Amino acid sequence: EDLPKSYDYDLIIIGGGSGGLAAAKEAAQYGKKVMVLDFVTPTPLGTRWGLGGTCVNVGCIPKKLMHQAALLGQALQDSRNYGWKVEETVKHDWDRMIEAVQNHIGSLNWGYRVALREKKVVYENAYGQFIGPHRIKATNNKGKEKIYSAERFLIATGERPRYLGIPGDKEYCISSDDLFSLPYCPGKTLVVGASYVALECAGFLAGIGLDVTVMVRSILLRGFDQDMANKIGEHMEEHGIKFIRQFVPIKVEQIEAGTPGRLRVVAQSTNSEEIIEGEYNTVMLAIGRDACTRKIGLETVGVKINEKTGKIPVTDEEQTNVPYIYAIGDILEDKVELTPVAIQAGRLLAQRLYAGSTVKCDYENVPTTVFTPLEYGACGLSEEKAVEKFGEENIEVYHSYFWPLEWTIPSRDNNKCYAKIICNTKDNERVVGFHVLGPNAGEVTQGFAAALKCGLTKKQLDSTIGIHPVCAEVFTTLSVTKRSGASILQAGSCG
Amino acid sequence: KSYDYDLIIIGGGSGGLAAAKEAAQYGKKVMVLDFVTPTPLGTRWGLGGTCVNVGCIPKKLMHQAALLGQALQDSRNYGWKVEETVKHDWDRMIEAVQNHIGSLNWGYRVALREKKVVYENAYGQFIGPHRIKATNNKGKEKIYSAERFLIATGERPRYLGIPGDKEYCISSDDLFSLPYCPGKTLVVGASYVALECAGFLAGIGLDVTVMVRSILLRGFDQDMANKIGEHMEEHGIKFIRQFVPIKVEQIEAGTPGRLRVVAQSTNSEEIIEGEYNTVMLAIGRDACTRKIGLETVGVKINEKTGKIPVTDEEQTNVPYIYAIGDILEDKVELTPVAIQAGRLLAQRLYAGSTVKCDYENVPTTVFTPLEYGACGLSEEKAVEKFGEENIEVYHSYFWPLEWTIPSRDNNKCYAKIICNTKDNERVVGFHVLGPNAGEVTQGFAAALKCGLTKKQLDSTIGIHPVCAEVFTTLSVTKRSGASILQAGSCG
Amino acid sequence: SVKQIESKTAFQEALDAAGDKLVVVDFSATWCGPSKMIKPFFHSLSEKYSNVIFLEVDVDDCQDVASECEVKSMPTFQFFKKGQKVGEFSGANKEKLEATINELV
Amino acid sequence: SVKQIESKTAFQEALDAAGDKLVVVDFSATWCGPSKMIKPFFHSLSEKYSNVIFLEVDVDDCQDVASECEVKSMPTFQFFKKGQKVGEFSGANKEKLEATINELV
Ligand SMILES: Cc1cc2nc3c(=O)[nH]c(=O)nc-3n(C[C@H](O)[C@H](O)[C@H](O)COP(=O)(O)OP(=O)(O)OC[C@H]3O[C@@H](n4cnc5c(N)ncnc54)[C@H](O)[C@@H]3O)c2cc1C
């Protein structure tokens, strides 16, 4: 008959990324028979990778590493003043770096196949595709299909880089997916977009010494506190990066082919019809990502999505409309598209289903950090979001600048690092927003996100003793509010 | 008002200066008396106190000098054509540090002028009720009066009381501005001052040795203390335990020279001698509360420690004589503390505020080769105060992503939290050993002021990829006994 | 010469192509440092013992073989006696290596 | 060259023995970068004006003097002619300096 007389697996996970792998290891922790299906369809230029998902292969890991490469460039300079006989300028080798990064990714691709073998989880490098109730069709690289069945199924396909849909892009343009393993030094680069992906990349490329440009449609970091967003943009421009606002490419043409080659980019203003063209060695598109929820047949099984975004609507328990088909990660509708989230969601969904746990995943006040030349960490509401939700008259914003002690001997960048908190007057001056721009922003923001899960208030904050001498201690003594209007710009080394 | 000022502060350090600026914020007439009596070798410095001149600032900067050494090595693996091995110049570094200190000294003199708070580089010293005797460097005395008085003299390095020390031995007070590269160095002590200094000296390439009486970092979680020692040992720093020097002999004078130490086993009688270029004593500090006449005014201290007993409002027995900072008795001797205490004591006295300073769960960080941050109770202190059966310790190792490409030090960085079973697994202790330990510990101290619990912690989403996120998923307890030693590159 | 097996098919088939001959397998990974350091030696070692059968397996180019065998670290060497797993160790300890091809010739 | 002042007496009183011949006071610090940057220009500019007597006041050595003149940052220049502050600016701006000297001769 139709339905399978029995189920091959208690559960099948479609997608071997951050969420799917954490969920597989968890379910299998309680014995259950599980199988993960992971296949990475190539990018237009043929680039592909191993197991582990977006963040491990073409996301967090490679990006933070390259960020560290740029930070080390700054460290090489900063050392001379602390008495280290460094050359004035040191050269950087693109290939050496890419190889080192690919070597770490490679070790992780491997670490994950082992962990799956460890928990006795069936890993299959095939493309999963629903065909009917409790039935799926896997297709390996060679083309050998096979159907499976499982009591339950978990969608965790994540997303992929989105293209412009203009002439010349899919052929001469690279996405973040290609950058992290590019066979040659990029050279003159034009970054298209203003997402954190765009600025983080534009940022470290400039850090290792490349001529980087960024073409922005409208704003910067759409969805983040704008006051902070611009402090970041301002900093990048201050540190070399060139910006082109209110513009968008309409066509790309190859001048010469090469490793790298040379390209011409024609672009048109956002409103006016003014058009300009520039010449670049490499053009990257960081204009957004798209859920892999279409070409995998959900209709044959019933799961309903959002006909326009591709996002999957689920219950706070991650379940979709069909009682045996759950979903997590980026593809989710109105959630948090971050690795730790997908992972928290995955580990919990498995405990409810097989451990008895009844704990739900909290999507409230999740902290985040953007790794731009000057790191930015945040948690909670932004300023603009605070006034809107609580009324301008109950929102007190406490801020201050700060100068990392480590930057005084190299004597650089004073009054750049900025800190601020949004407080709700009508709620015991509860801290509803946390923002920091500076060194190790993430290390700083983590503990404060926990404080926020404990409903931290201004009084409690003021009562905490800072650690000296450390950047983070600035948050323990903020006394100047934006409302009062007092100056927060500090004096330089000479007074 | 038959009173010159409304308040006089004796000591221009962390506490005194923060208190002066605060009081003066409400108009009050204030005057700060700051004088830095020289060290046995004549060394001295400007305004700002211990931390600014011979403490936190210079020490963290030199720590950064060593960290940059490691960074120079680490850049190569990331693709930077750094020359083979780079040399480091002692003098270049000292000059840069002194330049920044000189700058802070000036910011403090200017800051004081601004708030209209009289500054006098004079060694104050009580003579009677509401009266004090200041003595400048030249010798010109002068008596003053104020409605109230604040003691904030802090401490100074303590000596061994043995033959040859005060003449051939330097304290932290001299190190930070030493005119020449130290060379072969023997650090005496095991306080955080001792290990932090032993640590960065080794970091810039010097042969460093540390002679320990008994244990390391008494007063800190010992499990952590030894993880630190073990690390230093693996990174050069040679140790010598169960010993204490009995006399120092100069093999020669120099810039530097050649010295010779004589130490005797603490537990036995066996004695040994070594040869060093420089010998530093980091064996403790002593309150400057004796040679300043408190009897003539009445303030009572502790005849043996020198500490000053005060009310939770900082007031001593005499209603007009307050006190803050290190000298205080059984409190926490850290700059931020002294400063929080100072800013508050001024608000109660002149602002109407009734807020007291919290000495509970103050966070701290020791800047050793591998930083260590802590907040709350230690493990040993937790079992004692709550009973071993209600103390669950969750821990884990972690490998900073930044260290994987340089491929070094895996399973060194360690994190742990102490939980009170009987109180909803309240987090009563926080410990982290690794990069940027302080930046990591700060926010968690605030969480602790909000009574963080395991459930709440587990409910918080970590930031990836960042070290601190390790604390958001600790699942292995010491009790269970499971392995936490993770894996290396090849698996 | 060592055979760079490209399939679990050419693996279990090769294990056979060796009569009474000992099958020494080199589980390697281009991303593993000690793994590449001991590689040249395995190659010059493959010769010194043209009587033993030397097989190489890059855990990625054919992860389906290393998968079975239960490899966890690199480098890993496993010895086979006509299909049955006899010897096996980890690390780029070359002395230990040769001294195993001996012991279990 | 330039008369290095180290007293309030060598100042408040010597600002007389000069007469009217303009006297530019240089408030500097051994620890301020730009303070040094302009030092040579100030000393080699002293050799370029006889009708002008140059003075250099170190803010730390003469704390009494710097705070008695209301000094905020370095480098800070102040001009006098018979004990009258007829000029005063901050920063290591060499042009503004020689300019302020040539316009208050
Ligand atoms: C450049 C960049 C930088 C980022 N930086 C950060 C950061 O610093 N911090 C952070 O928290 N997040 C960061 N992110 C986001 C983070 O990587 C994602 O939120 C996370 O990877 C999502 O996990 P997931 O399990 O939902 O999906 P993914 O990790 O995307 O995994 C899905 C996997 O399934 C595969 N797959 C797709 N369709 C199928 C199919 N039909 N059959 C089988 N397999 C399929 C995919 O190819 C992929 O391997 C970054 C993302 C990018 C692109």
Ligand SMILES: Cc1cc2nc3c(=O)[nH]c(=O)nc-3n(C[C@H](O)[C@H](O)[C@H](O)COP(=O)(O)OP(=O)(O)OC[C@H]3O[C@@H](n4cnc5c(N)ncnc54)[C@H](O)[C@@H]3O)c2cc1C
């Ligand atoms: C090597 C070292 C490293 C340290 N590192 C750190 C660190 O990283 N973080 C941290 O939080 N703390 C650190 N500390 C401790 C910190 O410096 C002290 O906690 C802080 O300075 C105490 O402040 P205070 O105001 O009580 O006194 P102090 O800062 O000691 O100031 C007292 C001032 O009064 C002067 N004085 C003394 N007697 C008289 C008198 N009779 N008349 C007039 N003036 C007098 C002193 O000379 C001094 O200028 C360190 C200390 C040392 C020695």
